[PDB]
């Protein structure tokens, strides 16, 4: 269950997103539309550098940046699931107690 959920995330987002992953030339530099959209519409506290996004490593081989990300995201969700299932249980408790 949780593996699937992991994989289908990006695939099911791609249709909405791709649109803004188109390239534009901007003062002799490349940007995506998104990069720019954010650049245009001024957020009073949102400097690129805060972004928390891919900026590349020597350890990337391929041509896999997303595959591995969605796999990792599924394999972890397996754990988050188990824990949250049983929390869904305690949270379902019909216990009654004596004092506060």
């Amino acid at each position: 269950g949780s593996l699937g959920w992991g994989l289908l995330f990006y695939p099911n987002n791609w249709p909405a997103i791709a649109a803004f992953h188109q390239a534009t030339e901007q003062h002799g530099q490349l940007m995506t539309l998104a990069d720019l959209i954010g650049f245009h519409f001024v957020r009073t506290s949102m400097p690129e550098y805060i972004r928390m996004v891919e900026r590349g490593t020597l350890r990337t081989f391929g041509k896999d940046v997303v595959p591995v990300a969605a796999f990792f995201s599924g394999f972890v969700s397996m754990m988050v699931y188990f824990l949250w299932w049983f929390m869904g249980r305690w949270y379902s408790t019909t216990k009654v107690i004596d004092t506060i």
């Binding site: 791709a18 998104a34 990069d35 996004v53 891919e54």
Partner: peptide, 9 residues
């Protein structure tokens, strides 16, 4: 859109 590139940062 069969073009596309990662966010530039």
């Amino acid at each position: 859109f069969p073009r596309t590139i990662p966010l530039q940062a």
